[PDB]
């Protein structure tokens, strides 16, 4: 099978600079070139270009929201361009706004997909809730089809179409969420597993009845997003929102182990890698090298070993 | 339900000053604000003034007897009495001795409770097996009936009265117990979870079976002790005996909204946040952070997230 | 029982200088004092002297033959010689290639022995699949009875008699295998327990089928070798192969106290112990400290307590 990389050097989702050097800082680790040692076929798509929207008023209390829809939609373009020639969507983040282009491209595609979302918040805040204007506290609240029509329409964002229902998502690692998100995911009966699911049950457990859940019935393609807050800020710092008692570098690991075992990865995210915003250069190459690892992982890396088949070693 | 919290600001339970100093730092983290946002009514009655005892000669090998049984006996009177007007009393100190006060106090009100007492130490040295003088590593001495007469009368503890057996107490997190102690309870039976159970079951089932044994028969009120050393030097280095090896924040925080969950929370204990003792600012940050944040976790604060009922946040 | 420390100060087995300081560095920790301290009678057999063997030129790529074989040789007599005696052994290293020496020299007293080996590396690499020369790499394809004669004799091993099969070694800790060594383990179907195992069973579980597995038919001696790489960089730093996401000091200790309860240690190896590699004094002490910690732990230290028998503390 093939994978297609795609940068997303975007960061108008949110009020930190330095995320749009996500996709730099990932190559720059030899991201790329490690993948082409797996069994996967490599195509690196390079950097997408977004063209900034001059006089961006703010819609209402959302921020830039022309410039962020436009950027997605361009991303969705691009997605659901690589998933028709049936390879594997690798999406390198700024921001967690660009899973609405991501998801929406991939589901155009395979509308029958299901999305695991590893995150510290359910970013699902509607342009209603918010208390900051911020798009990449919304990403979910755009793709939901029980969220249609209980929002003003977006400047930018009317291209895009809910996908996805509340009964195709799953939460992993929620630990930072807002009364009104909290009321949403509650009211949608939305499955999550927030840290005091992972502390109770275990990771694999947890991993377990995700699966049963999303493909109990029906297989069907998988879209992995990945907020790399979603681990502890003692393995990934360099985010812009850090949570305390997070998701370990283990349990991130299995995480990914297991949805490479599954056979059915589609598609995946790596966001919110901010570069900048680490205190001193190794908690930049902390989170790097953990986002790094969390990528091969899902494309065959496991924890016991790897041996190319047919060679015999001795 | 209403909530008073009752600073003590006590340090003579132990060889280290500083300990006095935690309830003003814990208020100053904006601990009492943070808990008026949750459903309970908050009351916060101040610190109380404990008056020095003169002349305080140790008794044998015991220091401070009298200052310590002095400004317990002046505790329990205060906890007595919230307690009695059908209130939850939280107590923020200083050091651990002022747990007899405490769990006395609330005792008077509510003969039948049972204790969760989360430490890296049982605590539990008589008067004749301390090695050190240090009354906070004796609290539950002066506590159990079984222990009673099994050690001198003490210099200022003659109005303590032992208000439970070992039947009624659970230990959570040891690691880092006297030869003396452990052979007391292992002697009496006392129910136990040391860091190895904890490895063994997981915290999940951890608190699944003291629940059951605490609570398998009647349905008491909760006295929940918690010494902050409980958890990691890595989490709550500001203390006076870290031992390495300890609680997690996921596993301090599942601990406490287990604890909110069965409704039975009736009396809290913060205990030996010291500010003294960070070897950085930011050491001493982590330690009052985690310390309100477990706080707060007691009383209602969900990993999940919350909402206030009643409201359409659509 | 008895306990005889042998110290290995060996370091020829990888390119690293410096694990030949582990055993000074461990007795300076006040290790054997410690051990004294607990229920067994301890004789400090003091440190082996090496001949180096002159002109030891390298067998194709691996590096040092022939002075590795030797210590190795020499070091297989003295515990040959102590287990004879109905002693425990316990060898302080330099590096894992000593465990060749250390296993064979136990396997002669006691044929029926089972290996835990604790390592974040099978340590499994064959003189023909090695990518570095280094023997630190290879110590247990020289103890395979499976692997006998599918790799060159090499110079100084001669005397090597491959006295275990692959049925009676289990690993724990597998976070880093080459392609080589993990074609060997899956072709000889050795158990094992990488890091993903334990994250979804649980070091309590991981244990608790080790046991069953290794013991479930026949009772036997155990020899535990542990590389101190098994746990975390973050709990012990000071190693020549520091592999990130391993176990945690907890987990360590929890091994540790199961394989007392057993009452069946009969050899144990405390490997990798590198003083010179700490980036700061502290990385050293903390290093040593857990390594110390994990072996007080094999004979007795517990982590709720221990008290001396017949002797009434009250
Ligand atoms: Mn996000
Ligand atoms: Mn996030
Ligand atoms: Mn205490
Ligand atoms: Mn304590
Ligand atoms: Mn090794
Ligand atoms: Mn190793």
Same mark, same amino acid.
């Given at each position: =099978? ?24 990932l ?6 070139? =490690?993948?082409?040692?797996? %069994? ?20 209402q209390?959302?921020? +830039? ?7 997605? &939609? ?12 049936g390879t ?35 970013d699902? +805040? ?21 969220? =249609? ?34 009321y949403?995911?509650? !009211? ?20 377990? %009845? ?8 029906? =297989? ?7 907020d790399?807050?979603? $681990?502890?800020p003692?393995?990934?710092p ?7 008692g997070? $998701?370990?570098?283990? %349990? ?5 182990? &297991? ?5 059915? $990865? ?8 901010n ?7 190794? &908690?930049?190459?902390? !989170?790097? +090298?953990?986002?790094?690892? $969390? ?8 924890? %016991? ?10």
């Amino acid at each position: =099978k093939p994978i297609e990389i795609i940068g997303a050097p975007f960061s108008k989702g949110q009020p930190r600079g330095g995320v749009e050097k996500g996709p730099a800082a990932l190559r720059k680790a030899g991201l790329v070139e =490690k993948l082409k040692e797996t %069994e996967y076929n490599v195509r690196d798509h390079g950097d997408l270009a977004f063209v900034d929207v001059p006089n961006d008023s703010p819609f209402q209390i959302v921020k +830039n929201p022309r410039s962020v829809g436009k950027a997605n &939609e361009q991303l969705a373009a691009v997605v659901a361009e690589t998933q028709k020639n049936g390879t594997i969507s690798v999406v390198l983040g700024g921001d967690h706004s660009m899973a609405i282009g991501s998801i929406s491209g991939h589901a155009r595609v395979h509308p029958d997909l299901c999305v695991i979302w590893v995150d510290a918040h359910t970013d699902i +805040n509607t342009p209603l809730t918010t208390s900051s204007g911020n798009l990449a506290g919304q990403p979910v609240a755009f793709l939901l089809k029980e969220l =249609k029509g209980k929002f003003p329409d977006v400047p930018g964002f009317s291209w895009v179409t809910p996908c996805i229902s509340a009964k195709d998502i799953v939460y992993i690692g929620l630990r930072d969420v807002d009364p009104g998100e909290h009321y949403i995911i509650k !009211t949608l009966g939305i499955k999550y597993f927030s840290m005091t699911e992972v502390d109770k049950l275990g990771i694999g457990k947890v991993m377990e %009845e995700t699966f049963s859940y999303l493909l109990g019935r029906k =297989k069907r393609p998988i879209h992995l997003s990945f907020d790399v807050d979603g $681990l502890d800020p003692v393995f990934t710092p360099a985010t812009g929102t850090p949570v305390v008692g997070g $998701l370990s570098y283990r %349990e991130g690991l299995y995480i990914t182990e &297991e949805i490479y075992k599954t056979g059915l $990865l589609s598609g995946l995210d790596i966001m919110e890698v901010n570069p900048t915003l680490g205190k001193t250069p190794e &908690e930049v190459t902390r !989170t790097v +090298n953990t986002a790094v690892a $969390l990528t091969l992982s899902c494309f065959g890396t496991k924890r %016991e070993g790897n041996h190319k088949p047919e060679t015999d070693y001795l």
